Amino acid sequence: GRLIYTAGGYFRQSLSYLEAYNPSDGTWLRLADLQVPRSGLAGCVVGGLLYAVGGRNNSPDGNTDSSALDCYNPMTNQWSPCAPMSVPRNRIGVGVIDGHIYAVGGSHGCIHHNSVERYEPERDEWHLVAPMLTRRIGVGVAVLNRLLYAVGGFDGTNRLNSAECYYPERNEWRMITAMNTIRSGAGVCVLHNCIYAAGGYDGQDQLNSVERYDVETETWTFVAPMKHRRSALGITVHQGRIYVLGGYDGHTFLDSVECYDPDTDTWSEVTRMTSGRSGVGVAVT
């Protein structure tokens, strides 16, 4: 019985919540707080351990962008700090290839990173890899067929519909086909042989549209849209379905969790988070 973990987030200020949803029985479970509140972070899993990467803490004391990598062990319900990233990365994107965690883009103060770095859990070390062709914060990242995709985001001036693919064996990036829509802070994940980009912000409105890149056709297509417009949403995959969690719709911080079944091209509302929030990190184990 694998669970959907949601870490951190934003509502009034950056948050410390770690909660777990069980889709097969609809229950939520409150787990140990993050040591430091964070929003705009990302979550991923390696070898049954949950990692929370980057983000920022906007609080009464001011703002501090995070270079933190922290590791939560579901078996002990304990957080452990890991080696810091080379630089703080707010609104980071993250993906996993061959047991390594790739930290992509994001921001530190006013610097919008094109840089990328890779964590090896067995050594507790970060190493720089080739930088992206574009500076991207609020970037969505997905891994399919041991290739890493960075989609959308914000370069410091414009929000982006562009996307690019990283090839680890040659340590190089190339542009792929651009999305149909500019999306900053979209939900990006992989289901089956497609990369989905759900929601985000286009510079004017929050979006409920969801487009997917089929890697065999190199084409982006709109599928069924979400019920809720949402940016800074969490997203993940559980048992061949996409789960999107929370976000901001332009007026409300959502507690809604919607579920997409690609067999039927339909979204249904499956649960609610215990309170509304945006900017979460999400993963499954």
């Binding site: 934003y10 609104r91 609020g138 802070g185 912000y201 940016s231 800074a232 911080f253 945006s278």
Partner: peptide, 4 residues
């Protein structure tokens, strides 16, 4: 994007 003040909301995260």
């Amino acid at each position: 994007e003040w909301w995260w």
